[PDB]
């Protein structure tokens, strides 16, 4: 058989539904969202980390001349000076008032520790969802996993069940993000080849060990100092450490709907929001002919007690008469309240007690046992404890919290003087005619 139904996005909340077919008992279908897996599409842009500068041995020409060449090293720079007398422990290596010249150069490369301290800039897009479901029909359980896209059915027993699309798309990921040491930070990094001294992503590389590298961090060389050979240099602090000191808090502590986010897939998990439609195909073998199912007689509904609460705090009682033995499912045809158990042993004249919960204190609804059903009305009270994190609001409110007493007061309240007004107008017309008699 075939059926369809919509379920809200939420993990570990069984929903119980019925499929009705004349001549066959209505099977109880249990649907649970075991887990959620939102996986977007990712693109790698470039890596970055703390950098180490290079101060190579200088190129000193004793009583000659030199120049400022070019090279492919990232942040490569050169500069030359003349009339320099460098010294050293053995003495002065060379002195020529003008002919001496010194040439210095500088570049940079990722530090050796970068291999593990590196962060990466990611371009993300097109959030896609993967959902794991547990579906039980007639004590026939099945574990399945599928995308929410309406095209693909996940394979479980070769039963193709379609679902989606998502009611409303939610994505804590911004189009641009950064990843570091298992943490994901929402940030707007600059484009590849776009750098700013003292800013994040001052150094770039397609790979952690790629030979090609590019950066720009305001490295201007300084003139040689007094009498001692060295290379006085200058450069702005790494943007990596700066951004680290002020990167902001991780997205782990800011995502809505309690997302659980992991890096190696760059995905979210157990993050719930929205609703999903589902199409379900069922073999007719699983179905049971009604005559095989037991029949019931003169069943009554009795509310032992019920306090409005969050857990299955509502309790009900049922007295039934039957001509057969076996099992029947039970269902709450009214959405406002939902049971906790599916079926139970039956009896010729036995009675049972049932658990349930509701979104309103007004326990007025109808409930079905076997194929028959009976009404159930009562009042439930709010609880004392008002703070718990266990599953709650399994059903959303439908402005049905309005008590029957409030409806009674409202109905008798609204006036109907307009009828008196019309009667007054009619008698006015008749009296006007009578006066016209004169």
């Amino acid at each position: 058989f075939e059926h369809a139904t919509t379920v809200p996005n939420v993990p570990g909340i069984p929903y119980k539904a019925l499929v009705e077919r004349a001549g066959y008992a209505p099977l109880n279908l249990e649907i649970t969202v075991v887990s959620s897996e939102l996986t977007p599409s990712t693109n790698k842009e470039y890596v970055t980390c703390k950098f180490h500068t290079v101060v190579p041995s200088p190129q000193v020409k004793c009583c000659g001349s030199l120049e400022c060449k070019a090279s492919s090293k990232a942040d490569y720079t050169c500069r030359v000076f003349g009339g320099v007398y460098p010294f050293m422990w053995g003495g002065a290596q060379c002195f020529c008032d003008s002919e001496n010249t010194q040439l210095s150069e500088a570049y940079v490369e990722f530090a050796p520790d970068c291999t593990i301290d590196h962060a990466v800039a990611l371009k993300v897009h097109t959030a896609a969802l993967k959902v794991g479901l547990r579906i039980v029909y007639g004590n026939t359980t099945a574990r399945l996993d599928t995308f929410v896209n309406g095209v693909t059915p996940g394979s479980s027993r070769d039963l193709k069940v379609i679902a989606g699309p998502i009611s409303a798309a939610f994505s804590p990921f911004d189009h641009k993000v950064v990843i570091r040491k298992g943490l994901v930070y929402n940030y707007d990094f600059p484009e590849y080849g776009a750098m700013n001294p003292g800013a994040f992503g001052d150094i770039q590389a397609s790979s952690l060990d790629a030979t090609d590298i590019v950066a720009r961090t305001d490295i201007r060389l300084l003139k040689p100092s007094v009498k001692n050979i060295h290379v006085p240099y200058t450069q702005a602090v790494s943007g990596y450490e700066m951004w680290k000191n002020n990167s902001g808090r991780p997205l782990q502590e800011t995502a809505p709907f309690g997302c659980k986010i992991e890096v190696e897939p760059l995905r979210a998990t157990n993050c719930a929001y929205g609703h999903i439609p589902i199409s379900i195909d069922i073999p007719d073998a699983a179905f049971v002919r009604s005559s095989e199912s037991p029949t019931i007689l003169e069943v009554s509904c009795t509310v032992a007690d019920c306090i409005y609460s969050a857990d299955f705090g509502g309790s009900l009682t049922l007295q039934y008469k039957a001509n057969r033995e076996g099992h029947c499912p039970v269902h709450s045809h009214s959405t406002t309240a939902v049971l906790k158990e599916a079926t139970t042993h039956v009896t010729a004249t036995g009675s049972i007690t049932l658990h349930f919960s509701t979104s309103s204190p007004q326990a007025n609804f109808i409930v079905s046992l076997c194929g028959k059903k009976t009404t159930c009305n009562a009042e439930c009270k709010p609880p004392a404890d008002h703070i718990i994190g266990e599953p709650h609001k399994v059903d959303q409110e439908f402005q049905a919290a309005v008590s029957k007493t409030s409806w009674n007061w409202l109905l008798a309240l609204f006036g109907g003087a307009s009828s008196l007004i019309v009667v007054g107008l009619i008698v006015l017309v008749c009296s006007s005619m009578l006066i016209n008699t004169r």
């Binding site: 969050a310 709010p382 004392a384 703070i387 994190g389 007493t405 008196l420 007004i421 007054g424 009296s431």
Partner: protein, 103 residues
């Protein structure tokens, strides 16, 4: 050591501390709304939840009361004036037979 007050919505709230796995805590309603067949101050519960949509009903009730009262009074007064004026009667007189009914 100190104390902190965090408001929690009906939906649910996350909670972190130390270096252990967090715990999620949500909330529901417990104000004394439902009556017991006698006069009661139910409104307070409905005021504790959704301060919106709870006084709007009262405003609409007052508006309906005023509209009905004003319309009824205007119409009854005008009908009475029309029935009494061309009749041109006086109180405690013989002609006001219909008046014996009207007032």
């Amino acid at each position: 050591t100190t104390s902190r007050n965090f408001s929690v919505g009906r939906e649910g709230l996350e909670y972190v501390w130390g270096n252990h796995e967090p715990v999620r805590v949500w909330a529901q309603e417990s104000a004394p709304g439902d009556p017991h067949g006698w006069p009661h101050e139910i409104i307070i519960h409905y005021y504790h939840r959704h301060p919106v949509y709870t006084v709007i009903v009262l405003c609409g009730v007052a508006l309906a009361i005023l509209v009905g009262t004003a319309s009824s009074a205007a119409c009854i007064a005008k009908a009475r004036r029309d029935c009494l004026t061309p009749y041109a009667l006086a109180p405690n007189a013989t002609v006001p037979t219909a008046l014996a009914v009207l007032c």
